[PDB]
């Protein structure tokens, strides 16, 4: 898709230049971006390991020092 | 889409409290010329 083409155009050209920093700069904010999405209906596993389904709604609460650590990423 | 009818319920904020910043006005005093009983200006 066209969402794949803009990534493969900016990684094929760049991986000819920097072999070191490129794999970690793109893969950096995914440790931060996992904390922004809300929970609508989630899976769960109870204590003896078996799968249930839960429906709880939990907000995502991030401070302003995450959106200042994401702008520097 | 049971996650969409739940999200409408968490999105209902309490009622928007309104405070006004100017007095409610319909009428203003305007400058109109005045004439005496004969007809000419006063």
Q: At how many Å resolution was this determined?
A: 3.6
Q: How many Cβ atoms sit within 10 Å of the Cβ of residue A22?
A: 15
Experimental method: cryo-EM
The residues near B3 (Cβ < 8 Å, ≥ 6 apart) are: A40, A41
Contact B2 A41 (CB under 8 A): yes
- CB-based contacts of A40, cutoff 8 Å, min separation 6: A57, B3, B6, B7
Helix (H, G, I), strand (E, B) or coil at A43: strand
Asked if A41 and B3 come within 8 Å (Cβ–Cβ), the reply is yes
Rg over CA atoms, chain B: 28
CA atoms of A26 and B36, how far apart (whole Å): 87
CB A60 within 8 A of CB A38: yes
Residues in chain A whose Cβ is within 8 Å of chain B: 40-41, 55, 57
How far apart CA A2 and CA A42 sit, in angstroms, is: 30
CA distance A26 to B22: 53
Bridge partners for A52 per DSSP: A44
Check if the beta carbon of residue A64 is closer than 8 Å to that of residue B31. no
């Amino acid at each position: 898709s066209h969402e794949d083409y803009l990534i493969a155009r900016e990684l094929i050209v760049l991986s000819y230049s920097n072999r070191s920093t490129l794999a970690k700069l793109v893969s950096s904010p995914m440790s931060i971006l996992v904390a922004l999405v809300d929970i609508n209906g989630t899976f769960i596993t109870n204590e003896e390991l078996e799968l249930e389904f839960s429906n709880k709604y939990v907000r995502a609460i991030v401070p302003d020092q995450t959106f200042d650590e994401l702008k520097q990423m | 889409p049971k996650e969409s009818i739940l999200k409408k319920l968490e999105d209902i904020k309490p009622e928007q409290v309104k405070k006004q910043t100017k007095l409610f006005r319909i009428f203003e005093p305007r400058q109109l010329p005045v004439y005496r009983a004969n007809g000419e200006k006063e």
